[PDB]
Design a binder for this molecule. Structure first.
Ligand SMILES: C[S@@+](CC[C@H](N)C(=O)[O-])C[C@H]1O[C@@H](n2cnc3c(N)ncnc32)[C@H](O)[C@@H]1O
Ligand SMILES: OC[C@@]1(O)OC[C@@H](O)[C@@H](O)[C@@H]1O
Ligand SMILES: [Cl-]
Length: 259
């Protein structure tokens, strides 16, 4: 009597490599990253978003699902995609990004995109072990995938326990790696009651992950959101019209900001 999400995961893990590669992009929204990738390889530091993450966060911001403002803390900042984007938003006054260093983990990329001077990224900073800090906006994009959904479940619950102390009177956008397991749904219901917001599927996410984001603005039934996302993902395995929808990548400009 598994959840629809569990049914999706078992089916995903049964795909061949070619099937997986076709499925992951079927009918998704996608930014053309060729130009940014080539530029970044050449050491270019203006205009380019450092990752696909900038476009993901832009989608939420454009729809007023999160409204970054004041002091922004970005947990699991990686290369800095979310941080460099927030740096260009009018209401943002400072951005601090923290990420885990080490082999196999992405390190921050120094960039000169608009508002770069308001951003301080720091590697070698495992957020599970640091004290929470006051901020006006809390972003978190942590959650490592695994073919084992119980491992993802444990990762998601650990992230949720970790972020809660950082939430008080502030905007937020937090990745929920595995939102479909019963303990996670229940945890999310409790945290939504305590801190508000809603759970949303980003159309730029690949079909190979069931990730959803808990955003501070709006409200909605979490069980419905999760189940409708699971149904969509299950239905995409045998999608008749699977062409992705392409959008231009984000241009983050250049120059310092004065607040
Ligand atoms: C998907 S990425 C971030 C993408 C980012 N939002 C962007 O737009 O470029 C998640 C990052 O969180 C980092 N991470 C994982 N566990 C962490 C921890 N305990 N503390 C800090 N960072 C962590 C990973 O190394 C990875 O770089
Ligand atoms: O509502 C916020 C809070 O009180 O929730 C319970 C724990 O997570 C605390 O660390 C956290 O500050
Ligand atoms: Cl609803």
């Amino acid at each position: 009597g598994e959840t629809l999400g569990e049914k999706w995961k078992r089916q995903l893990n049964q795909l061949s490599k070619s099937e997986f590669n076709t499925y992951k992009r079927s009918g998704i929204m996608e930014v053309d990253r060729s130009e940014a990738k080539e530029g970044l390889k050449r050491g270019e530091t203006t205009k380019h978003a450092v990752s696909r993450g900038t476009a993901k966060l832009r989608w939420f911001v454009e729809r007023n699902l999160v409204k970054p403002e004041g002091k922004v803390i970005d947990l699991g900042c990686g290369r800095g995609g979310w941080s460099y984007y927030c740096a260009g938003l009018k209401k943002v006054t400072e951005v601090k990004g923290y990420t885990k260093g080490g082999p196999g983990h992405e390190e921050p990329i120094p960039m000169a995109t608009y508002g770069w001077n308001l951003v301080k990224l720091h590697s070698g900073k495992d957020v599970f072990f640091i004290p929470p800090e006051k901020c006006d906006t809390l972003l978190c994009d942590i959650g490592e995938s695994s073919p084992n959904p119980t491992i993802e479940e444990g990762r998601t619950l650990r992230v949720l326990k970790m972020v809660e102390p950082w939430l008080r009177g502030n905007q937020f956008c937090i990745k929920i790696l595995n939102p479909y397991m019963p303990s996670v749904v229940e945890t999310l219901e409790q945290m939504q009651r305590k801190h508000g917001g809603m759970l949303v599927r980003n159309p730029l996410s690949r079909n190979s992950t069931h990730e959803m984001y808990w955003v501070s603005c709006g409200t909605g039934n979490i069980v419905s959101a999760v189940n409708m996302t699971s149904r969509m993902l299950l239905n995409r395995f045998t999608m008749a019209h699977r062409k992705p929808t392409y959008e231009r990548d984000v241009d983050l400009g250049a120059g310092t900001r004065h607040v």
